[PDB]
C-alpha cells in the first residue's frame, strides 16, 4: 500500500551526468566548485613506485616481526568479627583482558549498565 | 522473547540469527554513543533523548531477566552458613536491646 | 564453590579456543592520535 | 526448503483472524523450562533450624 | 499481587527506576508504611546512626559530624604516633541482592508473621515494560511505599555485620538510657576501640578511625601479608580529591597510603560478597 | 590425472586481531608493508600495524557500513566506499577527507583504482558501475547494463580495462573509453560476488556459489572450472606463486592451485569466544606485498592472519 518495502532499487543512468550530462544543464552545486585541483603524488622518501619495485619485502617484514616479538618479550583490636578475610587469593581476576563478541555480555556493556543506571 | 520457529530450514534460521545479531550490535553501539553524548552535555536532539531512554530501559530489562534467571538457576548466593550468621547476629542484637516485636495493627487501635 | 552473577564466566578464553601457537591481539584505543599522521610530508 | 508463514505477535497488517494455537505458537517461550537448584533446600532448612 | 509497571527517570547522567503499583495495593502499602515507622520509632528499633532521621537536615548532619570529630579526646594529637582515618563508601548492590527468604526471616524477627508475609510476598511481583514481563525473584522493589523500612532495617543488619555487636552496643548505649548520635557513655568507652564515629546514610557508610602506631603497623602488616607490594605501586591507584589545591589535598606517604588501603581492606573483609560489597 | 599440480606448503593461522565492533567488511595492504587498512560495519576505518598487529589509527566519518577500502599506489591517498552512498578520498598526509564522490543512487559495494591513469571505479547496488576522475571528482562514465546489484569490480592497464561481476549472475568486460560492454559472460548460475586478476598469466577467476571459473582475458574464453568450495564465496585473491584463496560466508576457506585447479588445503577457522556458530564468515582476504601473509577480515569482528607452514612435504594428493 502506502507503507511498503522496496524489492528493487532505483536504477542509475537517467540523471545529471548520465549520458548527455542530462542535456547540459546550467545548474551546479556549491560542492561542485573547483577544489583540490592538483593530485599530490608520492615523493622519493614516501613510497614512490620506483622505490617499491626493487624492495625485498619478506626480509624487512621478518625483521620487523622479530623486533615486535622482541619488544613484546622484553616488556613481559576487633579480632571478634563474624567474617574473616573473604578475599584471600583474588588477584583482580583479569576480566579486563577478555574481549567478548556479545554486546549484552561484554565487559564494556557491564561497565556501561553499572554506571548509567542506579 | 526467545525466538524459535518450529519448522524452518537451518540456513535461513542461522542467517536470520546472524543479521539480528548485526542489528543488535548497531542498536547497542548507537545507544552507548548517544548516552555518552547526553552525559557530557553535547548537542543532542530531544527525540534522541527519548529514543535513548527507551533503548536503555529495554537493555536494563534484558539484563534483569538474565539476572533473575541466573538467580533461579545458580541457587542462593548467600551460602547458608553466612545466612545463619546474619540471622543469629540479628537475634542476639534484638535480645540485647530488649526489643518488643510489632504486633498486627489492632482492631481498636486508637492511632 | 558458588559462582556469583558478577563473574558468571561464559565463553571460554581466546587462548583456549585458538591454542598456544596462535597469539591473540585485543586492540581498543590506538597509538599515534589523529594529529600524528600517516605517510609523512617531505620536510 | 519450505518456509512456513510468519505469524507475528505484533503485526496484523491485513487485519486477519488467526486461531489461538497458531497465534501462540512461540515454542521458545514454552521450552524455557523454569528449573530450580538444590541449594535452596540447604538454605531454607538451615534457617528453620 | 497484580503486576507493577516500570519506567526510567532520566537524570542525564544516570537513570532512576520509577515503579507503578495498583491503587488498592498502594493504599494498603502506604498505611502499612505509616504504621511500621510509628511503631518502629516507639520501640526504638533504629539506633541513632541510621541517619535520615526526622529532626536532622543533612547540613545539620554534616555539622554534627564535624563537631563530633572535634569533640573526640586528643583527636588531633600525633606526638606519640597516632593516625585518623576517614572511610567513606557505599553498599554497592544493597537493594539488588536482598534474598527474600532471609528477608522474610528477619522481618518475622521484627514484626508479626502476617505483616512479614505481606511484605515478603509484595516484593515478588511481575515487572512490565511494553512487551517485557519478568518476575522479581531475587531483589526488592524500591517503589513500594514501605520499602524504606526494609532498606533501613537491612542496612542496620549490615551495620551489625561491620561494627560487631560489642562496638555497636557501645555506640547505642544501654537500652534503659540510650545516648544520642555522636556521644558515648564515658571517655573510656570512646577509646576502647579504633572505630570512633560511624554513621549510615541510606546506602552510604561513613566511619572514623583513631589508631595508635602499634595497631596501625599491625593492620598494615596484615594487609601487606595478604597483599604484598614490592614495586611501591600503592601510590599509583590511590585517588585523591582534585577539587582542593595542591597544598590542600592528601599527601602521598607510604605509611598513610598503606594504612588507608589496609583499613579499607579490613572493612571490606567484613561483608560477604553475596550480601553486599564495598 | 591429466595435470600434475605444483606442491604448495599449507597455511596456518598465527594471529587473531580483534577490536572492531562490527563485521569487518574490507581489507587492503599498503604498498610498503608498513600498515594495512580495514573497514567495518562499525562505520570506521582502522589502520593496523602489519608486523606487530597493533592498532595504528582509527578514522571516523562514515554514516553506514564501510564496504570497500583501497590505498593508492601512485598518490598518498586512501579511497573508501560505503552503504552510506558515499565514496571518499582520505589524504593520508592529513588523515582527513578531502574529496567526496557524489552520484551513487544507492549503496556502494566495492571500488578499485586504475594502476596508471588516476581513475577510480565503483560498484553500486543501483545496478551501475561509475568511473571517476580523482582530480576533478566527476563521473566520466556510468557503466550500466547489469540488472541487479553490482558486487565486485577490477581494473587493468591492458585490455578489457574494467571487469565486473554482479548479482544478475553475469560478468561484463567493458570499454573504459567508450563506456559500453564488450563481453557478457553468463556461465554462472548464482550471483558472481568475487572476480580476481592473475598477476602474470593474463587470465582471471570468478566466483559464485555454484562453482568458480577461470577465464582468458581478451574475449573471455572458458579455460577451466574449479569446483568443490560450494558455499556463498565472497572474495578471491591470487598469489604470484599461483595460490588462490576462496573465502565463503560460512567461514570455510579453501586454498587452490591456480594452474591445475587443485584443492590442496581446506581451512575451517573457529569463531571468537563471545561469537556465535552462525557468525563464522569471511568477507575479505588479501595477501601482503611480500605475498607471505594472508589477511582475512572475518564476520566475528576479527582479523585473522595466516602464514605458511615451514614443514616439508606431507602432502601431494
From Swiss-Prot, chain A:
Its main location: nucleus. Residues 50-76 have a biased composition (Basic and acidic residues). GO terms for molecular function: RNA binding. It is found in: Nucleus. The modification Phosphothreonine is found at residue 45. It holds the Pfam family Cwf_Cwc_15. The keyword Chaperone does not apply. GO terms for cellular component: catalytic step 2 spliceosome; mitochondrion; nuclear speck; nucleoplasm; nucleus; Prp19 complex; spliceosomal complex; U2-type catalytic step 2 spliceosome. Involved in pre-mRNA splicing as component of the spliceosome. Component of the PRP19-CDC5L complex that forms an integral part of the spliceosome and is required for activating pre-mRNA splicing. As a component of the minor spliceosome, involved in the splicing of U12-type introns in pre-mRNAs. Identified in the spliceosome C complex. Component of the PRP19-CDC5L splicing complex composed of a core complex comprising a homotetramer of PRPF19, CDC5L, PLRG1 and BCAS2, and at least three less stably associated proteins CTNNBL1, CWC15 and HSPA8. Interacts directly with CTNNBL1 in the complex. Component of the minor spliceosome, which splices U12-type introns. Belongs to the CWC15 family. PANTHER family: CELL CYCLE CONTROL PROTEIN CWF15, SPLICEOSOME-ASSOCIATED PROTEIN CWC15 HOMOLOG. This is Spliceosome-associated protein CWC15 homolog. It comes from Homo sapiens (Human). The gene is CWC15.
UniProtKB/Swiss-Prot annotation, chain B:
It is found in: Nucleus; Nucleus speckle. Widely expressed. Signal peptide: none annotated. The MPN (JAB/Mov34) domain mediates interaction with TSSC4 and SNRNP200. Has structural similarity with deubiquitinating enzymes, but lacks the residues that would bind the catalytic metal ion. Plays a role in pre-mRNA splicing as core component of precatalytic, catalytic and postcatalytic spliceosomal complexes, both of the predominant U2-type spliceosome and the minor U12-type spliceosome. Functions as a scaffold that mediates the ordered assembly of spliceosomal proteins and snRNAs. Required for the assembly of the U4/U6-U5 tri-snRNP complex, a building block of the spliceosome. Functions as a scaffold that positions spliceosomal U2, U5 and U6 snRNAs at splice sites on pre-mRNA substrates, so that splicing can occur. Interacts with both the 5' and the 3' splice site. This is Pre-mRNA-processing-splicing factor 8. The gene is PRPF8. The chain holds residues 724 to 834 of 2335 of the full protein.
Curated annotation (Swiss-Prot), chain D:
Identified in the spliceosome C complex. Associates with U4/U6-U5 tri-small nuclear ribonucleoproteins (U4/U6-U5 tri-snRNPs). Component of the minor spliceosome, which splices U12-type introns. Interacts with SKI, SMAD2,SMAD3, RBPJ, RB1, PABPN1, MAGEA1, SIRT1, FOXN3, U2AF2, DAXX and ATP1B4. Interacts with PPIL1. Interacts with VDR and RXRA; preferentially associates with VDR:RXRA heterodimers. Interacts with NCOR2. Interacts with MAML1. Interacts with NOTCH1 NICD; the interaction involves multimerized NOTCH1 NICD. This is SNW domain-containing protein 1. It comes from Homo sapiens (Human). Transmembrane segments: none annotated. Belongs to the SNW family. It comes from the Eukaryota. It is found in: Nucleus. There is a cross-link at residues 14, 42 (Glycyl lysine isopeptide (Lys-Gly) (interchain with G-Cter in SUMO2)). The chain holds residues 245 to 293 of 536 of the full protein.
Curated annotation (Swiss-Prot), chain F:
Keywords: Acetylation, mRNA processing, mRNA splicing, Nucleus, Phosphoprotein, Repeat, Spliceosome, WD repeat. WD repeats lie at residues 19-58, 61-100, 103-142, 145-184, 187-227, 228-266, 277-316. Its main location: nucleus. The modification Phosphoserine is found at residues 18, 208. It is found in: Nucleus; Nucleus speckle. One of its GO terms (biological process) is protein localization to nucleus. The keyword Repeat applies. Belongs to the WD repeat PRL1/PRL2 family. Involved in pre-mRNA splicing as component of the spliceosome. Component of the PRP19-CDC5L complex that forms an integral part of the spliceosome and is required for activating pre-mRNA splicing. As a component of the minor spliceosome, involved in the splicing of U12-type introns in pre-mRNAs. Identified in the spliceosome C complex. Component of the PRP19-CDC5L splicing complex composed of a core complex comprising a homotetramer of PRPF19, CDC5L, PLRG1 and BCAS2, and at least three less stably associated proteins CTNNBL1, CWC15 and HSPA8. Interacts (via its WD40 repeat domain) directly with CDC5L (via its C-terminal); the interaction is required for mRNA splicing but not for spliceosome assembly. Component of the minor spliceosome, which splices U12-type introns. Within this complex, interacts with CRIPT. Also interacts directly in the complex with BCAS2 and PRPF19. This is Pleiotropic regulator 1. The chain holds residues 184 to 500 of 514 of the full protein.
Amino acid at each position: 500500500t502506502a507503507a511498503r518495502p522496496t524489492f528493487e532499487p532505483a536504477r542509475g543512468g537517467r540523471g545529471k551526468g548520465e549520458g548527455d550530462l542530462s542535456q547540459l544543464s546550467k545548474q551546479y552545486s556549491s560542492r561542485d566548485l573547483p577544489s583540490h585541483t592538483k593530485i599530490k603524488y608520492r615523493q622519493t622518501t614516501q613510497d614512490a613506485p620506483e622505490e617499491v619495485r626493487n624492495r625485498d619485502f619478506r626480509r624487512e617484514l621478518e625483521e620487523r616481526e622479530r623486533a615486535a616479538a622482541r619488544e613484546k618479550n622484553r616488556d613481559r583490636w576487633d579480632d571478634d568479627v563474624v567474617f574473616k578475610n573473604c578475599a584471600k587469593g583474588v588477584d583482580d581476576q583479569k576480566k579486563d583482558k577478555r574481549f567478548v563478541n556479545d554486546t549484552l555480555r561484554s565487559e564494556f556493556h557491564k561497565k556501561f549498565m553499572e554506571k548509567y543506571i542506579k | 522473547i526467545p525466538w524459535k520457529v518450529p519448522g524452518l530450514p537451518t540456513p535461513i534460521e542461522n542467517m536470520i540469527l546472524r543479521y539480528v545479531k548485526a542489528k543488535a550490535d548497531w542498536w547497542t553501539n548507537t545507544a552507548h554513543y548517544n548516552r555518552e553524548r547526553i552525559r557530557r552535555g553535547a548537542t543532542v536532539d530531544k527525540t534522541v533523548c527519548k529514543k535513548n531512554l527507551g533503548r536503555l530501559t529495554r537493555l536494563y530489562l534484558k539484563a534483569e531477566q538474565e539476572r533473575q534467571h541466573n538467580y533461579l538457576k545458580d541457587g542462593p548466593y548467600i551460602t547458608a552458613e553466612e545466612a545463619v550468621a546474619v540471622y543469629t547476629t540479628t537475634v542476639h542484637w534484638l535480645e540485647s536491646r530488649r526489643f518488643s516485636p510489632i504486633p498486627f495493627p489492632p482492631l481498636s487501635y486508637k492511632h | 564453590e558458588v559462582v556469583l552473577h558478577e563473574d558468571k564466566k561464559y565463553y571460554p578464553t581466546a587462548e583456549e579456543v585458538y591454542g598456544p601457537e596462535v597469539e591473540t591481539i585485543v586492540q581498543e584505543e590506538d597509538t599515534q592520535p589523529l594529529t600524528e599522521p600517516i605517510i609523512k610530508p617531505v620536510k | 526448503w519450505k518456509i512456513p508463514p510468519c505469524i507475528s505477535n505484533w503485526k496484523n497488517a491485513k487485519g486477519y483472524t488467526i486461531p489461538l494455537d497458531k497465534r501462540l505458537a512461540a515454542d521458545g517461550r514454552g521450552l524455557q523450562t523454569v528449573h530450580i537448584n538444590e541449594n535452596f533446600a540447604k538454605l531454607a532448612e538451615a534457617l528453620y533450624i | 499481587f497484580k503486576e507493577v509497571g516500570i519506567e526510567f527517570m532520566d537524570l542525564y547522567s544516570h537513570l532512576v527506576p520509577v515503579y507503578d503499583v495498583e491503587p488498592l495495593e498502594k493504599i494498603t502499602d502506604a498505611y502499612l508504611d505509616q504504621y511500621l515507622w510509628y511503631e518502629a520509632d516507639k520501640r526504638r528499633l533504629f539506633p541513632p546512626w541510621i541517619k535520615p532521621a526526622d529532626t536532622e537536615p543533612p547540613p545539620l548532619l554534616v555539622y554534627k559530624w564535624c563537631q563530633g570529630i572535634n569533640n573526640l579526646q586528643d583527636v588531633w594529637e600525633t606526638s606519640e604516633g597516632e593516625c585518623n582515618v576517614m572511610l567513606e563508601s557505599r553498599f554497592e548492590k544493597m537493594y539488588e541482592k536482598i534474598d527474600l527468604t532471609l528477608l522474610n526471616r528477619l522481618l518475622r524477627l521484627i514484626v508479626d508473621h502476617n505483616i512479614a508475609d505481606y511484605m515478603t510476598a509484595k516484593n515478588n511481583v511481575v515487572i512490565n515494560y511494553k512487551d517485557m514481563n519478568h518476575t522479581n525473584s531475587y531483589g526488592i522493589i524500591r517503589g513500594l511505599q514501605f520499602a524504606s523500612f526494609i532498606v533501613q532495617y537491612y542496612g542496620l543488619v549490615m551495620d551489625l555485620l561491620v561494627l560487631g555487636l560489642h562496638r555497636a552496643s557501645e555506640m547505642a548505649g544501654p537500652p534503659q538510657m540510650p545516648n544520642d548520635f555522636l556521644s558515648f557513655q564515658d571517655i573510656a568507652t570512646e577509646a576502647a576501640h579504633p572505630i570512633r564515629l560511624f554513621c549510615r546514610y541510606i546506602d552510604r557508610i561513613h566511619i572514623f578511625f583513631r589508631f595508635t602506631a602499634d595497631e596501625a603497623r599491625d593492620l598494615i602488616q596484615r594487609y601487606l601479608t595478604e597483599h604484598p607490594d614490592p614495586n611501591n605501586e600503592n601510590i599509583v591507584g590511590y585517588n585523591n580529591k582534585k577539587c582542593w589545591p595542591r597544598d590542600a589535598r592528601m599527601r602521598l606517604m607510604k605509611h598513610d597510603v598503606n594504612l588507608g588501603r589496609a583499613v579499607f581492606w579490613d572493612i571490606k573483609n567484613r561483608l560477604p560478597r553475596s550480601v553486599t560489597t564495598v | 590425472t591429466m595435470p600434475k599440480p605444483q606442491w604448495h606448503p599449507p597455511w596456518k593461522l598465527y594471529r587473531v586481531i580483534s577490536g572492531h565492533l562490527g563485521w569487518v567488511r574490507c581489507i587492503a595492504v599498503e604498498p610498503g608493508n608498513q600498515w594495512f587498512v580495514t573497514g567495518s560495519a562499525d562505520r570506521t576505518i582502522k589502520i593496523w600495524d602489519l608486523a606487530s598487529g597493533k592498532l595504528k589509527l582509527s578514522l571516523t566519518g562514515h554514516i553506514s557500513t564501510v564496504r570497500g577500502v583501497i590505498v593508492s599506489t601512485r598518490s598518498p591517498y586512501l579511497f573508501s566506499c560505503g552503504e552510506d552512498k558515499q565514496v571518499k578520498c582520505w589524504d593520508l598526509e592529513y588523515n582527513k577527507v578531502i574529496r567526496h564522490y557524489h552520484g551513487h543512487l544507492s549503496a556502494v559495494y566495492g571500488l578499485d583504482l586504475h594502476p596508471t591513469i588516476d581513475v577510480l571505479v565503483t560498484c553500486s547496488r543501483d545496478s551501475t558501475a561509475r568511473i571517476w576522475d580523482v582530480r576533478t571528482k566527476a563521473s566520466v562514465h556510468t557503466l550500466s547494463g547489469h540488472t541487479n546489484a553490482v558486487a565486485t569490480v577490477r581494473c587493468q592497464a591492458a585490455e578489457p580495462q574494467i571487469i565486473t561481476g554482479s548479482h544478475d549472475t553475469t560478468i561484463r568486460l567493458w570499454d573504459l573509453v567508450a563506456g559500453k560492454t564488450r563481453v557478457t559472460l553468463t556461465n554462472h548460475k548464482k550471483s558472481v560476488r568475487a572476480v580476481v586478476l592473475h598477476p602474470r598469466h593474463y587470465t582471471f577467476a570468478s566466483g559464485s556459489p555454484d562453482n568458480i571459473k577461470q577465464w582468458k582475458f581478451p574475449d573471455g574464453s572458458f579455460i577451466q572450472n574449479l569446483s568443490g568450495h560450494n558455499a556463498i564465496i565472497n572474495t578471491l585473491t591470487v598469489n604470484s606463486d599461483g595460490v588462490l584463496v576462496s573465502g565463503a560466508d560460512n567461514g570455510t576457506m579453501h586454498l587452490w592451485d591456480w594452474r591445475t585447479g587443485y584443492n590442496f588445503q581446506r581451512v575451517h577457522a573457529a569463531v571468537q569466544p563471545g561469537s556465535l556458530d552462525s557468525e563464522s564468515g569471511i568477507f575479505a582476504c588479501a595477501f601482503d606485498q611480500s605475498e607471505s601473509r594472508l589477511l582475512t577480515a572475518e564476520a566475528d569482528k576479527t582479523i585473522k592472519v595466516y602464514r605458511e607452514d615451514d614443514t616439508a612435504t606431507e602432502e601431494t594428493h
